[PDB]
Design an enzyme around this catalytic site. Structure first.
Site, PDB file in Angstrom:
ATOM      1  N   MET A  26       0.855  -1.218   0.000  1.00  0.00           N
ATOM      2  CA  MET A  26       0.000   0.000   0.000  1.00  0.00           C
ATOM      3  C   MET A  26       0.884   1.259   0.000  1.00  0.00           C
ATOM      4  O   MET A  26       0.531   2.222  -0.710  1.00  0.00           O
ATOM      5  CB  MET A  26      -0.924   0.011   1.214  1.00  0.00           C
ATOM      6  CG  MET A  26      -2.116  -0.902   1.050  1.00  0.00           C
ATOM      7  SD  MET A  26      -3.251  -0.848   2.455  1.00  0.00           S
ATOM      8  CE  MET A  26      -2.103  -0.738   3.824  1.00  0.00           C
ATOM      9  N   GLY A  27       2.002   1.230   0.739  1.00  0.00           N
ATOM     10  CA  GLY A  27       2.951   2.357   0.870  1.00  0.00           C
ATOM     11  C   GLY A  27       4.069   2.045   1.858  1.00  0.00           C
ATOM     12  O   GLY A  27       3.862   2.308   3.066  1.00  0.00           O
ATOM     13  N   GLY A  28       7.870   2.118   4.797  1.00  0.00           N
ATOM     14  CA  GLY A  28       7.553   1.087   5.806  1.00  0.00           C
ATOM     15  C   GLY A  28       6.587   0.045   5.258  1.00  0.00           C
ATOM     16  O   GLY A  28       5.438   0.430   4.895  1.00  0.00           O
ATOM     17  N   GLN A  29       7.011  -1.230   5.236  1.00  0.00           N
ATOM     18  CA  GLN A  29       6.409  -2.313   4.399  1.00  0.00           C
ATOM     19  C   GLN A  29       5.051  -2.731   4.989  1.00  0.00           C
ATOM     20  O   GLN A  29       5.033  -3.659   5.852  1.00  0.00           O
ATOM     21  CB  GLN A  29       7.372  -3.505   4.292  1.00  0.00           C
ATOM     22  CG  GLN A  29       6.825  -4.668   3.470  1.00  0.00           C
ATOM     23  CD  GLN A  29       7.901  -5.388   2.688  1.00  0.00           C
ATOM     24  OE1 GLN A  29       8.446  -6.399   3.130  1.00  0.00           O
ATOM     25  NE2 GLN A  29       8.202  -4.882   1.499  1.00  0.00           N
ATOM     26  N   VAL A  30       3.963  -2.085   4.529  1.00  0.00           N
ATOM     27  CA  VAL A  30       2.553  -2.430   4.898  1.00  0.00           C
ATOM     28  C   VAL A  30       1.828  -3.040   3.682  1.00  0.00           C
ATOM     29  O   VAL A  30       1.647  -2.340   2.676  1.00  0.00           O
ATOM     30  CB  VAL A  30       1.792  -1.220   5.460  1.00  0.00           C
ATOM     31  CG1 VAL A  30       1.805  -0.044   4.499  1.00  0.00           C
ATOM     32  CG2 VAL A  30       0.366  -1.593   5.841  1.00  0.00           C
ATOM     33  N   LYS A  45       1.434  -5.102   8.543  1.00  0.00           N
ATOM     34  CA  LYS A  45       2.819  -4.606   8.691  1.00  0.00           C
ATOM     35  C   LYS A  45       3.716  -5.811   8.945  1.00  0.00           C
ATOM     36  O   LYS A  45       3.353  -6.652   9.779  1.00  0.00           O
ATOM     37  CB  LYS A  45       2.877  -3.551   9.787  1.00  0.00           C
ATOM     38  CG  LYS A  45       1.877  -2.417   9.594  1.00  0.00           C
ATOM     39  N   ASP A 139       3.693  14.244  15.753  1.00  0.00           N
ATOM     40  CA  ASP A 139       3.743  13.970  14.284  1.00  0.00           C
ATOM     41  C   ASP A 139       2.312  13.967  13.717  1.00  0.00           C
ATOM     42  O   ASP A 139       1.897  12.936  13.174  1.00  0.00           O
ATOM     43  CB  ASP A 139       4.459  12.644  13.990  1.00  0.00           C
ATOM     44  CG  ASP A 139       5.005  12.529  12.567  1.00  0.00           C
ATOM     45  OD1 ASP A 139       5.711  13.463  12.135  1.00  0.00           O
ATOM     46  OD2 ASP A 139       4.736  11.487  11.907  1.00  0.00           O
TER      47      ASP A 139
END
Length: 262
Positions: A26-27, A28-30, A45, A139
């Site tokens: 989808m987009g 840090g490996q998630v 994740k 953040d």
């Protein structure tokens, strides 16, 4: 605790990494994954035992907070975890998009209607974080705000463990379609603008309610000492208005995602 179980809705399933189909990143490996045994589509994740120890510390702290927050509806929920000798897989609630990707798709302002419901959800999530776990977020960005096709808005599990002023900036960015500091070529120039220049308030020529302009003006109080805590933002008329007001977020979201791509 719960490892080797997925807990979706009320149900609970004996689960294992092989019981999941990988539908792609989808987009840090998630990952976007399908639970074979139901057809439930979920976010996953992967934490590689061999990864950056700093990524992995960040992921473990962020998970700690999410597991504590089962009771908060404004934070993405964990369904469970799988531990192998080489990997941890963290099953998360799948959402449609983040507010940044949603802005990029819109290619313009997001209606005050939508941003009201989002301010309620985010402020409440951050209040729940401080109040009930003494977590500050540090953040708050459009990329950390998640929406789904059923109109839910939730705070994303990234640095969910480490303020008001960034919520203000996030809200002006999405209200106008423009990052107030998009002309700054370095991070230090941004901070220079924050300290030296007038706060980047909503303009008066886009039909924004006085409530919305007041909420942002409040959030962007340049003196740290005169900025309100959450206790006091939750009492702002803007929040109160959009707590009660029925807004069809689900329909508006579907329209946007259908009539645009990536």
């Amino acid at each position: 605790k719960q490892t080797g179980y997925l807990t979706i809705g009320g149900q609970r399933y004996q689960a294992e990494i092989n019981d999941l189909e990988n539908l792609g990143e989808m987009g840090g490996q998630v990952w976007k994954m399908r639970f074979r045994k139901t057809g439930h589509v979920i976010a996953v994740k992967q934490m590689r035992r061999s990864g950056n120890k700093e990524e992995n510390k960040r992921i473990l702290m962020d998970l700690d907070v999410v597991l504590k927050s089962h009771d908060c509806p404004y934070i993405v929920q964990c369904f469970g975890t799988f531990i192998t000798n080489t990997d941890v897989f963290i099953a998360m609630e799948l959402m449609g998009t983040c507010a940044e990707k949603l802005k990029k798709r819109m290619q313009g302002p997001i209606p005050e209607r939508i941003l009201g419901k989002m301010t309620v959800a985010i402020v409440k999530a951050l209040y729940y974080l401080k109040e009930k776990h003494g977590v500050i977020h540090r953040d708050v960005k459009p990329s950390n705000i998640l929406l789904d096709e059923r109109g839910q808005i939730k705070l994303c599990d990234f640095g969910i463990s480490g303020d008001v002023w960034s919520l203000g900036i996030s809200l002006v960015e999405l209200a106008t379609g423009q990052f107030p500091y998009k002309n700054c070529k370095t991070d230090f120039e941004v901070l220079t603008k924050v300290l030296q220049e007038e706060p980047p308030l909503l303009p008066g020529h886009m039909g924004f309610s006085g409530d919305f302009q007041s909420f942002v003006k409040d959030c962007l109080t340049k003196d740290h000492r005169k900025r309100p805590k959450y206790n006091k933002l939750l009492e702002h008329s803007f929040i109160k208005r959009y707590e009660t007001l029925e807004v069809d977020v689900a329909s508006w979201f579907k329209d946007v995602m259908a009539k645009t791509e990536s």
